[PDB]
Amino acid sequence: VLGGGCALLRCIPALDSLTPANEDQKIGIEIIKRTLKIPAMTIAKNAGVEGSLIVEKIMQSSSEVGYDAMAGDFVNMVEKGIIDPTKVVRTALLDAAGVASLLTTAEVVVTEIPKE
Amino acid sequence: VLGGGCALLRCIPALDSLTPANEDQKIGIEIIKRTLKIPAMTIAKNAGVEGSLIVEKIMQSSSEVGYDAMAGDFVNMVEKGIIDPTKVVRTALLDAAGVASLLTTAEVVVTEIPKE
Numbered sequence: 555v556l557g558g559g560c561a562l563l564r565c566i567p568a569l570d571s572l573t574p575a576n577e578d579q580k581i582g583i584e585i586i587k588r589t590l591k592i593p594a595m596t597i598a599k600n601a602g603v604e605g606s607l608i609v610e611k612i613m614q615s616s617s618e619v620g621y622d623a624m625a626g627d628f629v630n631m632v633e634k635g636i637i638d639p640t641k642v643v644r645t646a647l648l649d650a651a652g653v654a655s656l657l658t659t660a661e662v663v664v665t666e667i668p669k670e
Numbered sequence: 671v672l673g674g675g676c677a678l679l680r681c682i683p684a685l686d687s688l689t690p691a692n693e694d695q696k697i698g699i700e701i702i703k704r705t706l707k708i709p710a711m712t713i714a715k716n717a718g719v720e721g722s723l724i725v726e727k728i729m730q731s732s733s734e735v736g737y738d739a740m741a742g743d744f745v746n747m748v749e750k751g752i753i754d755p756t757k758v759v760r761t762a763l764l765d766a767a768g769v770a771s772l773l774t775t776a777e778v779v780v781t782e783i784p785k786e
Protein backbone atom coordinates (compact mmCIF):
# COMPACT_ATOMS: atom_id res chain seq x y z
CA VAL A 555 0.00 0.00 0.00
CA LEU A 556 1.05 3.65 -0.06
CA GLY A 557 3.83 4.60 2.32
CA GLY A 558 4.39 7.66 4.45
CA GLY A 559 1.23 7.02 6.46
CA CYS A 560 -1.06 7.80 3.51
CA ALA A 561 -2.56 4.30 3.55
CA LEU A 562 -4.35 5.07 6.81
CA LEU A 563 -5.18 8.59 5.62
CA ARG A 564 -7.04 7.20 2.60
CA CYS A 565 -9.14 5.04 4.94
CA ILE A 566 -10.75 8.04 6.67
CA PRO A 567 -13.65 8.26 4.14
CA ALA A 568 -14.47 4.61 4.87
CA LEU A 569 -15.34 5.65 8.44
CA ASP A 570 -17.91 8.21 7.27
CA SER A 571 -20.17 5.47 5.87
CA LEU A 572 -20.64 3.86 9.30
CA THR A 573 -23.78 4.26 11.39
CA PRO A 574 -22.98 4.11 15.13
CA ALA A 575 -25.52 2.26 17.25
CA ASN A 576 -25.36 4.78 20.11
CA GLU A 577 -23.36 7.80 21.26
CA ASP A 578 -20.43 5.85 22.73
CA GLN A 579 -19.90 3.95 19.47
CA LYS A 580 -19.87 7.31 17.69
CA ILE A 581 -17.23 8.50 20.17
CA GLY A 582 -15.10 5.44 19.43
CA ILE A 583 -15.43 5.89 15.67
CA GLU A 584 -14.38 9.54 16.03
CA ILE A 585 -11.41 8.46 18.16
CA ILE A 586 -10.23 6.12 15.40
CA LYS A 587 -10.89 8.79 12.76
CA ARG A 588 -8.70 11.30 14.59
CA THR A 589 -6.05 8.64 15.23
CA LEU A 590 -5.74 7.70 11.55
CA LYS A 591 -3.83 10.95 10.86
CA ILE A 592 -1.11 10.30 13.48
CA PRO A 593 1.55 8.39 11.45
CA ALA A 594 1.71 10.98 8.66
CA MET A 595 1.73 13.83 11.18
CA THR A 596 4.59 12.23 13.11
CA ILE A 597 6.60 11.58 9.94
CA ALA A 598 6.12 15.20 8.86
CA LYS A 599 6.98 16.52 12.33
CA ASN A 600 10.23 14.54 12.45
CA ALA A 601 11.15 16.20 9.13
CA GLY A 602 10.94 19.67 10.69
CA VAL A 603 7.72 20.80 9.00
CA GLU A 604 4.14 21.31 10.18
CA GLY A 605 2.37 17.96 10.18
CA SER A 606 -1.16 19.38 10.10
CA LEU A 607 -0.65 21.30 6.85
CA ILE A 608 1.06 18.30 5.25
CA VAL A 609 -1.81 15.99 6.18
CA GLU A 610 -4.40 18.50 4.98
CA LYS A 611 -2.67 18.88 1.62
CA ILE A 612 -2.40 15.09 1.33
CA MET A 613 -6.11 14.65 2.00
CA GLN A 614 -7.08 17.42 -0.43
CA SER A 615 -4.97 15.86 -3.21
CA SER A 616 -5.67 12.90 -5.48
CA SER A 617 -5.60 9.35 -4.15
CA GLU A 618 -2.20 8.56 -5.70
CA VAL A 619 -0.41 11.65 -4.32
CA GLY A 620 1.37 11.75 -0.99
CA TYR A 621 4.27 13.44 0.81
CA ASP A 622 7.95 12.55 0.41
CA ALA A 623 9.48 13.69 3.69
CA MET A 624 13.00 12.78 2.56
CA ALA A 625 12.74 14.94 -0.56
CA GLY A 626 10.22 17.21 1.15
CA ASP A 627 7.59 17.52 -1.57
CA PHE A 628 4.31 16.05 -2.77
CA VAL A 629 4.90 13.18 -5.20
CA ASN A 630 3.44 9.91 -6.48
CA MET A 631 4.31 7.29 -3.87
CA VAL A 632 3.98 4.24 -6.13
CA GLU A 633 6.12 5.93 -8.78
CA LYS A 634 8.78 7.03 -6.27
CA GLY A 635 8.73 3.66 -4.50
CA ILE A 636 7.46 4.81 -1.09
CA ILE A 637 5.37 1.73 -0.32
CA ASP A 638 4.58 -0.23 2.83
CA PRO A 639 3.56 -3.85 3.44
CA THR A 640 -0.18 -3.93 4.09
CA LYS A 641 0.33 -6.66 6.69
CA VAL A 642 2.58 -4.35 8.73
CA VAL A 643 0.04 -1.51 8.63
CA ARG A 644 -2.96 -3.63 9.58
CA THR A 645 -1.04 -5.45 12.33
CA ALA A 646 0.17 -2.20 13.88
CA LEU A 647 -3.30 -0.66 13.79
CA LEU A 648 -5.01 -3.75 15.21
CA ASP A 649 -2.57 -4.20 18.10
CA ALA A 650 -2.47 -0.52 19.03
CA ALA A 651 -6.25 -0.15 18.97
CA GLY A 652 -6.86 -3.36 20.86
CA VAL A 653 -4.56 -2.58 23.75
CA ALA A 654 -5.30 1.14 24.05
CA SER A 655 -9.08 0.63 23.94
CA LEU A 656 -8.87 -1.78 26.88
CA LEU A 657 -6.56 0.62 28.71
CA THR A 658 -9.09 3.45 28.35
CA THR A 659 -11.82 1.42 30.14
CA ALA A 660 -10.24 1.70 33.60
CA GLU A 661 -11.60 3.44 36.67
CA VAL A 662 -9.39 2.00 39.43
CA VAL A 663 -5.65 1.24 39.47
CA VAL A 664 -4.08 -0.99 42.14
CA THR A 665 -0.30 -0.97 42.58
CA GLU A 666 2.18 -2.16 45.20
CA ILE A 667 3.52 0.24 47.81
CA PRO A 668 7.24 0.75 47.03
CA LYS A 669 8.87 -1.16 49.88
CA GLU A 670 12.22 -1.15 48.06
CA VAL B 671 -8.59 47.04 9.86
CA LEU B 672 -9.68 43.41 9.73
CA GLY B 673 -10.11 41.68 13.07
CA GLY B 674 -9.28 38.20 14.26
CA GLY B 675 -5.59 38.66 13.50
CA CYS B 676 -6.12 38.76 9.73
CA ALA B 677 -4.69 42.29 9.46
CA LEU B 678 -1.21 41.01 10.30
CA LEU B 679 -1.76 37.93 8.12
CA ARG B 680 -2.41 40.13 5.09
CA CYS B 681 0.93 41.90 5.70
CA ILE B 682 2.96 38.72 5.09
CA PRO B 683 3.22 39.36 1.30
CA ALA B 684 4.66 42.82 2.05
CA LEU B 685 7.69 41.10 3.61
CA ASP B 686 8.47 39.13 0.44
CA SER B 687 9.35 42.32 -1.47
CA LEU B 688 12.23 43.14 0.90
CA THR B 689 15.88 42.58 0.01
CA PRO B 690 17.92 41.81 3.15
CA ALA B 691 21.38 43.36 3.23
CA ASN B 692 23.02 40.25 4.73
CA GLU B 693 22.10 36.88 6.22
CA ASP B 694 21.24 38.17 9.70
CA GLN B 695 18.77 40.69 8.29
CA LYS B 696 17.17 37.83 6.36
CA ILE B 697 16.94 35.87 9.62
CA GLY B 698 15.20 38.80 11.30
CA ILE B 699 12.77 39.25 8.41
CA GLU B 700 11.93 35.54 8.56
CA ILE B 701 11.40 35.82 12.32
CA ILE B 702 8.88 38.61 11.77
CA LYS B 703 7.23 36.66 8.93
CA ARG B 704 6.74 33.62 11.17
CA THR B 705 5.56 35.81 14.05
CA LEU B 706 2.87 37.55 11.99
CA LYS B 707 0.72 34.39 12.10
CA ILE B 708 0.68 34.14 15.91
CA PRO B 709 -2.46 36.16 16.85
CA ALA B 710 -4.72 34.22 14.47
CA MET B 711 -3.32 30.86 15.60
CA THR B 712 -3.79 31.81 19.26
CA ILE B 713 -7.38 32.94 18.69
CA ALA B 714 -8.16 29.74 16.78
CA LYS B 715 -6.47 27.58 19.43
CA ASN B 716 -8.50 29.18 22.22
CA ALA B 717 -11.60 28.26 20.17
CA GLY B 718 -10.69 24.57 20.33
CA VAL B 719 -9.70 24.14 16.68
CA GLU B 720 -6.38 23.70 14.88
CA GLY B 721 -4.81 27.12 14.38
CA SER B 722 -2.48 26.10 11.55
CA LEU B 723 -5.27 24.90 9.25
CA ILE B 724 -7.36 27.99 10.02
CA VAL B 725 -4.46 30.31 9.19
CA GLU B 726 -3.67 28.40 6.00
CA LYS B 727 -7.29 28.62 4.84
CA ILE B 728 -7.33 32.34 5.68
CA MET B 729 -4.20 32.96 3.62
CA GLN B 730 -5.47 30.90 0.68
CA SER B 731 -8.77 32.84 0.62
CA SER B 732 -9.61 36.28 -0.75
CA SER B 733 -8.38 39.41 1.00
CA GLU B 734 -11.79 40.24 2.52
CA VAL B 735 -12.39 36.80 4.06
CA GLY B 736 -11.41 35.90 7.60
CA TYR B 737 -12.33 33.46 10.36
CA ASP B 738 -15.14 34.05 12.86
CA ALA B 739 -13.99 32.07 15.89
CA MET B 740 -17.19 32.83 17.81
CA ALA B 741 -19.38 31.49 15.01
CA GLY B 742 -16.63 29.12 13.89
CA ASP B 743 -16.72 29.70 10.15
CA PHE B 744 -15.06 31.68 7.38
CA VAL B 745 -16.92 34.93 6.74
CA ASN B 746 -16.48 38.54 5.59
CA MET B 747 -14.89 40.42 8.48
CA VAL B 748 -16.09 43.92 7.57
CA GLU B 749 -19.62 42.69 6.85
CA LYS B 750 -19.83 40.81 10.17
CA GLY B 751 -18.23 43.68 12.08
CA ILE B 752 -15.06 41.91 13.25
CA ILE B 753 -12.77 44.94 13.01
CA ASP B 754 -9.82 46.21 15.02
CA PRO B 755 -8.32 49.67 15.55
CA THR B 756 -5.21 49.96 13.39
CA LYS B 757 -3.49 51.98 16.12
CA VAL B 758 -3.87 49.08 18.57
CA VAL B 759 -2.43 46.56 16.11
CA ARG B 760 0.56 48.67 15.11
CA THR B 761 1.29 49.66 18.72
CA ALA B 762 1.22 46.05 19.90
CA LEU B 763 3.48 44.90 17.08
CA LEU B 764 5.96 47.74 17.54
CA ASP B 765 6.30 47.32 21.31
CA ALA B 766 6.55 43.52 21.18
CA ALA B 767 9.17 43.58 18.42
CA GLY B 768 11.22 46.33 20.02
CA VAL B 769 11.52 44.67 23.40
CA ALA B 770 11.91 41.06 22.23
CA SER B 771 14.57 41.91 19.63
CA LEU B 772 16.69 43.56 22.31
CA LEU B 773 16.07 40.61 24.63
CA THR B 774 17.37 38.17 22.00
CA THR B 775 20.74 39.99 21.75
CA ALA B 776 22.03 38.82 25.15
CA GLU B 777 24.95 36.53 25.91
CA VAL B 778 25.48 37.13 29.64
CA VAL B 779 22.92 37.53 32.44
CA VAL B 780 23.86 38.92 35.86
CA THR B 781 21.49 38.45 38.80
CA GLU B 782 21.66 38.81 42.58
CA ILE B 783 22.32 35.75 44.73
CA PRO B 784 19.10 35.08 46.69
CA LYS B 785 20.11 36.14 50.19
CA GLU B 786 16.46 36.23 51.30
Ligand SMILES: Nc1ncnc2c1ncn2[C@@H]1O[C@H](COP(=O)(O)OP(=O)(O)O)[C@@H](O)[C@H]1O
Pocket residue numbers: 556557558559597621622623624625636637638
Ligand atom coordinates in the same frame (compact mmCIF):
# COMPACT_ATOMS: atom_id res chain seq x y z
N1 LIG C 1 10.99 8.96 1.93
C1 LIG C 1 9.88 8.84 2.69
N2 LIG C 1 8.89 9.75 2.63
C2 LIG C 1 7.78 9.64 3.38
N3 LIG C 1 7.56 8.64 4.23
C3 LIG C 1 8.46 7.65 4.39
C4 LIG C 1 9.70 7.69 3.61
N4 LIG C 1 10.42 6.60 3.96
C5 LIG C 1 9.69 5.92 4.88
N5 LIG C 1 8.53 6.55 5.14
C6 LIG C 1 7.49 6.09 6.08
O1 LIG C 1 8.05 5.96 7.39
C7 LIG C 1 7.55 4.78 8.02
C8 LIG C 1 8.72 3.98 8.56
O2 LIG C 1 9.14 4.51 9.80
P1 LIG C 1 9.88 3.52 10.82
O3 LIG C 1 10.91 4.30 11.59
O4 LIG C 1 10.24 2.27 10.08
O5 LIG C 1 8.62 3.19 11.76
P2 LIG C 1 8.09 1.70 12.01
O6 LIG C 1 9.20 1.03 12.78
O7 LIG C 1 6.82 1.91 12.78
O8 LIG C 1 7.86 1.12 10.64
C9 LIG C 1 6.82 3.97 6.98
O9 LIG C 1 5.44 3.88 7.32
C10 LIG C 1 6.98 4.72 5.68
O10 LIG C 1 5.71 4.82 5.03
Ligand SMILES: Nc1ncnc2c1ncn2[C@@H]1O[C@H](COP(=O)(O)OP(=O)(O)O)[C@@H](O)[C@H]1O
Pocket residue numbers: 672673674675713737738739740741752753754
Ligand atom coordinates in the same frame (compact mmCIF):
# COMPACT_ATOMS: atom_id res chain seq x y z
N1 LIG D 1 -15.83 36.89 16.81
C1 LIG D 1 -14.50 36.95 16.57
N2 LIG D 1 -13.93 36.17 15.64
C2 LIG D 1 -12.61 36.22 15.39
N3 LIG D 1 -11.76 37.03 16.04
C3 LIG D 1 -12.20 37.86 17.00
C4 LIG D 1 -13.63 37.87 17.34
N4 LIG D 1 -13.79 38.78 18.32
C5 LIG D 1 -12.57 39.30 18.59
N5 LIG D 1 -11.62 38.75 17.81
C6 LIG D 1 -10.18 39.09 17.83
O1 LIG D 1 -9.66 38.86 19.14
C7 LIG D 1 -8.75 39.90 19.50
C8 LIG D 1 -9.13 40.42 20.88
O2 LIG D 1 -8.55 39.61 21.88
P1 LIG D 1 -8.30 40.26 23.33
O3 LIG D 1 -8.58 39.22 24.38
O4 LIG D 1 -8.99 41.60 23.36
O5 LIG D 1 -6.72 40.50 23.20
P2 LIG D 1 -6.07 41.96 23.30
O6 LIG D 1 -6.30 42.37 24.72
O7 LIG D 1 -4.63 41.71 22.94
O8 LIG D 1 -6.80 42.80 22.28
C9 LIG D 1 -8.89 41.00 18.48
O9 LIG D 1 -7.66 41.15 17.77
C10 LIG D 1 -9.97 40.56 17.53
O10 LIG D 1 -9.53 40.75 16.19
